[PDB]
mmCIF file of all heavy atoms in Angstrom:
data_model
loop_
_atom_site.group_PDB
_atom_site.id
_atom_site.type_symbol
_atom_site.label_atom_id
_atom_site.label_comp_id
_atom_site.label_asym_id
_atom_site.label_seq_id
_atom_site.Cartn_x
_atom_site.Cartn_y
_atom_site.Cartn_z
ATOM 1 N N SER A 1 0.797 -1.232 0.000
ATOM 2 C CA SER A 1 0.000 0.000 0.000
ATOM 3 C C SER A 1 0.831 1.283 0.000
ATOM 4 O O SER A 1 0.349 2.328 -0.426
ATOM 5 C CB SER A 1 -0.919 0.034 1.210
ATOM 6 O OG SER A 1 -0.228 0.296 2.412
ATOM 7 N N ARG A 2 2.075 1.188 0.469
ATOM 8 C CA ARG A 2 3.090 2.245 0.453
ATOM 9 C C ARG A 2 4.153 2.063 -0.639
ATOM 10 O O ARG A 2 5.166 2.747 -0.625
ATOM 11 C CB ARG A 2 3.660 2.460 1.867
ATOM 12 C CG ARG A 2 4.407 1.251 2.438
ATOM 13 C CD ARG A 2 4.970 1.506 3.839
ATOM 14 N NE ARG A 2 3.924 1.599 4.873
ATOM 15 C CZ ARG A 2 3.879 2.415 5.909
ATOM 16 N NH1 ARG A 2 4.793 3.300 6.144
ATOM 17 N NH2 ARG A 2 2.904 2.350 6.750
ATOM 18 N N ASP A 3 3.937 1.189 -1.619
ATOM 19 C CA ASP A 3 4.693 1.240 -2.872
ATOM 20 C C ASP A 3 4.393 2.562 -3.605
ATOM 21 O O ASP A 3 3.238 2.874 -3.907
ATOM 22 C CB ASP A 3 4.374 0.055 -3.807
ATOM 23 C CG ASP A 3 4.805 -1.343 -3.344
ATOM 24 O OD1 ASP A 3 5.619 -1.478 -2.406
ATOM 25 O OD2 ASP A 3 4.410 -2.322 -4.023
ATOM 26 N N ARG A 4 5.422 3.340 -3.950
ATOM 27 C CA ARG A 4 5.292 4.503 -4.842
ATOM 28 C C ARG A 4 4.684 4.046 -6.171
ATOM 29 O O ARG A 4 5.252 3.197 -6.862
ATOM 30 C CB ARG A 4 6.663 5.160 -5.070
ATOM 31 C CG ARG A 4 7.300 5.743 -3.807
ATOM 32 C CD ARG A 4 8.665 6.373 -4.086
ATOM 33 N NE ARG A 4 9.685 5.380 -4.467
ATOM 34 C CZ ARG A 4 10.103 5.060 -5.671
ATOM 35 N NH1 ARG A 4 9.674 5.652 -6.731
ATOM 36 N NH2 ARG A 4 10.975 4.127 -5.843
ATOM 37 N N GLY A 5 3.520 4.581 -6.533
ATOM 38 C CA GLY A 5 2.781 4.156 -7.726
ATOM 39 C C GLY A 5 1.862 2.947 -7.552
ATOM 40 O O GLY A 5 1.467 2.349 -8.551
ATOM 41 N N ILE A 6 1.473 2.580 -6.321
ATOM 42 C CA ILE A 6 0.527 1.480 -6.054
ATOM 43 C C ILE A 6 -0.775 1.595 -6.853
ATOM 44 O O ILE A 6 -1.257 0.590 -7.366
ATOM 45 C CB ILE A 6 0.235 1.330 -4.546
ATOM 46 C CG1 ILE A 6 -0.677 0.138 -4.207
ATOM 47 C CG2 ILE A 6 -0.414 2.576 -3.938
ATOM 48 C CD1 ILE A 6 -0.129 -1.212 -4.646
ATOM 49 N N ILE A 7 -1.327 2.797 -7.047
ATOM 50 C CA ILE A 7 -2.545 2.987 -7.844
ATOM 51 C C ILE A 7 -2.329 2.492 -9.274
ATOM 52 O O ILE A 7 -3.122 1.711 -9.784
ATOM 53 C CB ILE A 7 -3.017 4.456 -7.815
ATOM 54 C CG1 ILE A 7 -3.681 4.771 -6.470
ATOM 55 C CG2 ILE A 7 -3.992 4.759 -8.957
ATOM 56 C CD1 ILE A 7 -3.882 6.252 -6.208
ATOM 57 N N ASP A 8 -1.240 2.888 -9.925
ATOM 58 C CA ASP A 8 -0.979 2.498 -11.305
ATOM 59 C C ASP A 8 -0.558 1.030 -11.457
ATOM 60 O O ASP A 8 -0.812 0.441 -12.510
ATOM 61 C CB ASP A 8 -0.001 3.489 -11.929
ATOM 62 C CG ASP A 8 -0.732 4.776 -12.314
ATOM 63 O OD1 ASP A 8 -1.451 4.754 -13.338
ATOM 64 O OD2 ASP A 8 -0.599 5.798 -11.608
ATOM 65 N N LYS A 9 -0.031 0.393 -10.406
ATOM 66 C CA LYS A 9 0.126 -1.068 -10.356
ATOM 67 C C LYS A 9 -1.216 -1.780 -10.268
ATOM 68 O O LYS A 9 -1.466 -2.700 -11.035
ATOM 69 C CB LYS A 9 1.000 -1.481 -9.165
ATOM 70 C CG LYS A 9 2.482 -1.168 -9.392
ATOM 71 C CD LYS A 9 3.386 -1.476 -8.187
ATOM 72 C CE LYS A 9 3.343 -2.940 -7.741
ATOM 73 N NZ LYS A 9 4.334 -3.240 -6.687
ATOM 74 N N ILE A 10 -2.096 -1.344 -9.372
ATOM 75 C CA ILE A 10 -3.433 -1.918 -9.205
ATOM 76 C C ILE A 10 -4.256 -1.734 -10.479
ATOM 77 O O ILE A 10 -4.870 -2.688 -10.934
ATOM 78 C CB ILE A 10 -4.154 -1.340 -7.972
ATOM 79 C CG1 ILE A 10 -3.479 -1.837 -6.684
ATOM 80 C CG2 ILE A 10 -5.622 -1.773 -7.959
ATOM 81 C CD1 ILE A 10 -4.012 -1.211 -5.408
ATOM 82 N N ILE A 11 -4.244 -0.556 -11.105
ATOM 83 C CA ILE A 11 -4.967 -0.301 -12.358
ATOM 84 C C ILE A 11 -4.458 -1.210 -13.474
ATOM 85 O O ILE A 11 -5.261 -1.783 -14.201
ATOM 86 C CB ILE A 11 -4.877 1.185 -12.749
ATOM 87 C CG1 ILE A 11 -5.716 2.026 -11.774
ATOM 88 C CG2 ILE A 11 -5.338 1.454 -14.181
ATOM 89 C CD1 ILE A 11 -5.471 3.522 -11.883
ATOM 90 N N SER A 12 -3.143 -1.398 -13.603
ATOM 91 C CA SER A 12 -2.578 -2.304 -14.612
ATOM 92 C C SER A 12 -2.976 -3.762 -14.383
ATOM 93 O O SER A 12 -3.007 -4.551 -15.320
ATOM 94 C CB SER A 12 -1.057 -2.225 -14.615
ATOM 95 O OG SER A 12 -0.592 -0.915 -14.815
ATOM 96 N N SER A 13 -3.280 -4.125 -13.141
ATOM 97 C CA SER A 13 -3.755 -5.441 -12.728
ATOM 98 C C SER A 13 -5.263 -5.652 -12.863
ATOM 99 O O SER A 13 -5.725 -6.771 -12.659
ATOM 100 C CB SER A 13 -3.357 -5.694 -11.292
ATOM 101 O OG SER A 13 -3.681 -7.011 -10.927
ATOM 102 N N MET A 14 -6.056 -4.637 -13.190
ATOM 103 C CA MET A 14 -7.453 -4.859 -13.556
ATOM 104 C C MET A 14 -7.520 -5.513 -14.933
ATOM 105 O O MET A 14 -6.992 -4.972 -15.900
ATOM 106 C CB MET A 14 -8.245 -3.550 -13.569
ATOM 107 C CG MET A 14 -8.341 -2.910 -12.193
ATOM 108 S SD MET A 14 -9.234 -3.913 -10.985
ATOM 109 C CE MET A 14 -8.538 -3.233 -9.478
ATOM 110 N N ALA A 15 -8.163 -6.676 -15.025
ATOM 111 C CA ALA A 15 -8.238 -7.512 -16.216
ATOM 112 C C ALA A 15 -6.884 -7.573 -16.948
ATOM 113 O O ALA A 15 -6.743 -7.036 -18.049
ATOM 114 C CB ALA A 15 -9.399 -7.042 -17.082
ATOM 115 N N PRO A 16 -5.863 -8.189 -16.355
ATOM 116 C CA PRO A 16 -4.504 -8.004 -16.815
ATOM 117 C C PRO A 16 -4.293 -8.569 -18.227
ATOM 118 O O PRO A 16 -3.464 -8.041 -18.960
ATOM 119 C CB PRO A 16 -3.666 -8.641 -15.712
ATOM 120 C CG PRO A 16 -4.560 -9.740 -15.162
ATOM 121 C CD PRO A 16 -5.932 -9.095 -15.230
ATOM 122 N N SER A 17 -5.087 -9.558 -18.655
ATOM 123 C CA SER A 17 -5.089 -10.126 -20.009
ATOM 124 C C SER A 17 -5.907 -9.365 -21.065
ATOM 125 O O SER A 17 -5.984 -9.804 -22.210
ATOM 126 C CB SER A 17 -5.563 -11.571 -19.934
ATOM 127 O OG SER A 17 -6.832 -11.661 -19.329
ATOM 128 N N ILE A 18 -6.490 -8.210 -20.732
ATOM 129 C CA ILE A 18 -7.098 -7.277 -21.689
ATOM 130 C C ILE A 18 -6.104 -6.151 -21.950
ATOM 131 O O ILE A 18 -5.694 -5.461 -21.018
ATOM 132 C CB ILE A 18 -8.430 -6.722 -21.143
ATOM 133 C CG1 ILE A 18 -9.490 -7.811 -20.884
ATOM 134 C CG2 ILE A 18 -8.999 -5.643 -22.071
ATOM 135 C CD1 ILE A 18 -9.851 -8.693 -22.073
ATOM 136 N N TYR A 19 -5.705 -5.956 -23.202
ATOM 137 C CA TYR A 19 -4.726 -4.938 -23.568
ATOM 138 C C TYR A 19 -5.341 -3.538 -23.658
ATOM 139 O O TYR A 19 -6.485 -3.387 -24.077
ATOM 140 C CB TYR A 19 -4.063 -5.318 -24.886
ATOM 141 C CG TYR A 19 -2.917 -4.409 -25.265
ATOM 142 C CD1 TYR A 19 -1.735 -4.454 -24.515
ATOM 143 C CD2 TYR A 19 -3.040 -3.476 -26.308
ATOM 144 C CE1 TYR A 19 -0.669 -3.594 -24.816
ATOM 145 C CE2 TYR A 19 -1.977 -2.614 -26.617
ATOM 146 C CZ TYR A 19 -0.782 -2.675 -25.872
ATOM 147 O OH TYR A 19 0.248 -1.843 -26.153
ATOM 148 N N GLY A 20 -4.561 -2.506 -23.332
ATOM 149 C CA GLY A 20 -4.958 -1.110 -23.459
ATOM 150 C C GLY A 20 -6.113 -0.728 -22.539
ATOM 151 O O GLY A 20 -6.216 -1.233 -21.425
ATOM 152 N N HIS A 21 -7.004 0.148 -23.007
ATOM 153 C CA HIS A 21 -8.216 0.567 -22.283
ATOM 154 C C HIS A 21 -7.951 1.031 -20.846
ATOM 155 O O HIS A 21 -8.728 0.749 -19.936
ATOM 156 C CB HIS A 21 -9.299 -0.526 -22.348
ATOM 157 C CG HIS A 21 -9.748 -0.936 -23.722
ATOM 158 N ND1 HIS A 21 -10.254 -2.187 -24.041
ATOM 159 C CD2 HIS A 21 -9.829 -0.148 -24.819
ATOM 160 C CE1 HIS A 21 -10.579 -2.141 -25.337
ATOM 161 N NE2 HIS A 21 -10.338 -0.930 -25.830
ATOM 162 N N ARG A 22 -6.865 1.766 -20.610
ATOM 163 C CA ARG A 22 -6.486 2.171 -19.259
ATOM 164 C C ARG A 22 -7.499 3.092 -18.595
ATOM 165 O O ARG A 22 -7.640 3.045 -17.383
ATOM 166 C CB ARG A 22 -5.083 2.771 -19.282
ATOM 167 C CG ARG A 22 -4.526 2.847 -17.863
ATOM 168 C CD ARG A 22 -3.072 3.287 -17.844
ATOM 169 N NE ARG A 22 -2.547 3.216 -16.483
ATOM 170 C CZ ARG A 22 -2.094 2.149 -15.869
ATOM 171 N NH1 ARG A 22 -2.005 0.987 -16.436
ATOM 172 N NH2 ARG A 22 -1.695 2.261 -14.646
ATOM 173 N N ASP A 23 -8.260 3.860 -19.361
ATOM 174 C CA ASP A 23 -9.399 4.615 -18.841
ATOM 175 C C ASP A 23 -10.538 3.723 -18.346
ATOM 176 O O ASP A 23 -11.126 4.022 -17.317
ATOM 177 C CB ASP A 23 -9.912 5.575 -19.904
ATOM 178 C CG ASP A 23 -8.996 6.774 -20.139
ATOM 179 O OD1 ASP A 23 -8.389 7.277 -19.174
ATOM 180 O OD2 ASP A 23 -8.906 7.253 -21.288
ATOM 181 N N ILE A 24 -10.831 2.605 -19.013
ATOM 182 C CA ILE A 24 -11.806 1.644 -18.492
ATOM 183 C C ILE A 24 -11.249 0.934 -17.275
ATOM 184 O O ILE A 24 -11.938 0.871 -16.268
ATOM 185 C CB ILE A 24 -12.287 0.651 -19.560
ATOM 186 C CG1 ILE A 24 -13.283 1.397 -20.445
ATOM 187 C CG2 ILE A 24 -12.965 -0.585 -18.950
ATOM 188 C CD1 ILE A 24 -13.716 0.667 -21.702
#
């Protein structure tokens, strides 16, 4: 939770096998 950039790690891990769509 105190990793610098934890939000962007968690967002990249939403449906990790779907490419792109970072706004979704």
Side-chain angles (χ1 to χ4, degrees):
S1 74
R2 64 179 70 218
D3 293 345
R4 296 179 293 99
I6 184 59
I7 284 166
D8 282 284
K9 286 176 59 173
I10 291 174
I11 290 168
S12 304
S13 186
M14 296 297 157
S17 57
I18 299 304
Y19 187 69
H21 302 153
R22 195 173 186 82
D23 287 324
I24 283 171

